[PDB]
Write the structure tokens for this entry.
Amino acid sequence: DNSYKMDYPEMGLCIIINNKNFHKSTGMTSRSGTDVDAANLRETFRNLKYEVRNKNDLTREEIVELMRDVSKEDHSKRSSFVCVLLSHGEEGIIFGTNGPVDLKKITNFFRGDRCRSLTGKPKLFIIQACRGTELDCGIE
Amino acid sequence: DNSYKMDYPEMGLCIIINNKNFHKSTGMTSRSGTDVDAANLRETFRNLKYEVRNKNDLTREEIVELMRDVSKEDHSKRSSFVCVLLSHGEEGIIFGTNGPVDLKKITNFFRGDRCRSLTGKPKLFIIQACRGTELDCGIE
Amino acid sequence: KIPVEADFLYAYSTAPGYYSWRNSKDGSWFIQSLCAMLKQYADKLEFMHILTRVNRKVATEFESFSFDATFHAKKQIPCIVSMLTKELYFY
Amino acid sequence: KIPVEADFLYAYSTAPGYYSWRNSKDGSWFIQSLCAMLKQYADKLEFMHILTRVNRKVATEFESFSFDATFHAKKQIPCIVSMLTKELYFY
Ligand SMILES: *[C@@](=O)([C]N([C])[C][C][C][C][C][C])[C]([C]C(=O)[O-])[N]C(=O)[C]([C][C])N1[C]=C(C([C])([C])[C])N=C([N][C]C2=NON=C2[C])C1=O
Ligand SMILES: *[C@@](=O)([C]N([C])[C][C][C][C][C][C])[C]([C]C(=O)[O-])[N]C(=O)[C]([C][C])N1[C]=C(C([C])([C])[C])N=C([N][C]C2=NON=C2[C])C1=O
């Protein structure tokens, strides 16, 4: 069988982290329009049968803490896991309201040996954030 | 039309760079087995109707030089482009027999505004090389 | 025994090293494209093909408009990174 | 007008930051798995699906065996990076 088993009692969780306002001490601008995405994703994934949880303006600490607790949950009856991050960022980084957080850190909570109840199950990370400062001028 | 037009007179080029022997000064071990890969790739893409070109033990300069020339060729009558790199490497890097080459360096030659005859056509880079020194111990 | 990095999928809104665009009233180009694509095809297409559709929608239907020449008429391409072992269907 | 970074596909043999494995007589786990899947499926499957089959085969059928404990019993997962705008069929 070359297709993930998506017939578990539940599709699984869909954690949406939407960061719009950032501490002045960061110099990050307010991400106007992000709420539209958040609400959009909530409806989309509800239609897909995912247990959606929205979390707004979280500090780096709050992000790591949240992701760590989600990974410690029992996903035995869940077919998969979805995490959406909406914020500013750099390559391999997403910003909490008060500072940078390396993506590898929150992703590791869910790696095979780390999250037993998700082992062998699809783990999706949808990321809306910058990965640098290069601009694509396009062609043709 | 959600599928690439692959009915051009030719499927395209398949450039295979097989680096097995490295200069003593690099401290790179001979890549035993790589020839089997090169031969395997040659037969596979021949069956897929690609114009295959095998190149062995190229220096950083030769890799760049080759990639520049290939990108300067006229691909108008070709459906796509394939490049396979077999060698030692690090994150975002591949080694010539005499030193490191940034993948972004040879990849740029084919970017939209750079290789007009391939604009809008699939450009594939198959890379057999390490991307760091992390080991995966597996689970279960 | 399987890799601990296996079965992960990262749907990046933009290519490595690049900026990612967001519209003040509609939201980010990538998220609005992803939602719209999931709406039309989540019941038909395998996830990778849906994300490819997202790549096409963002790359073709969007361009930046800014009074600042530096950020004007810019484009964007999403980046699908899959370590998945099987095909994924939302049904 | 499309992104200059669009229509690129990077089929990496391994995840970011990881080692890639090679067998002295059979070749690398990735390349031999890739060739096997292309030989069997290139006449029907879309490219991303073939690569996903490669992912599974590499993560499932291969494990290192070394006299050096540090490098013994290790696994590998390939990494598909797509900035493709359409589905790819080799026919
Ligand atoms: C992205 O993550 C982070 N950027 C800002 C880099 C920070 C790293 C620190 C380096 C010193 C972020 C994505 C997000 O969803 O918020 N990117 C943006 O804020 C993007 C950048 C391309 N961005 C920038 C800008 C201006 C031109 C700098 C004000 N404007 C918009 N939107 C308005 C717009 N202007 O022209 N077309 C549009 C849609 C924007 O999305
Ligand atoms: C890869 O790029 C890494 N390069 C840059 C060398 C750096 C290693 C650091 C050692 C001080 C390279 C890619 C390639 O296809 O040639 N990968 C390797 O050389 C891998 C690394 C995991 N590798 C290493 C080794 C030993 C254990 C270091 C000798 N051996 C093999 N193959 C034999 C083997 N041993 O156990 N199982 C197998 C299949 C190998 O592929």
About this structure: Residues B 31, 88-89, 128-130; D 19-24, 28, 64-66, 68, 71 surround PZN (ligand 2) (CB under 6 Å). The CA atoms of residues 13 and 52 of chain D lie 12 Å apart. Helices of chain D lie at 29-41, 47-61. The interface with chain C takes residues 1-6, 15, 18, 46, 48-49, 51-52, 55-56, 59-60, 63, 75-87 of chain D (CB under 8 Å).
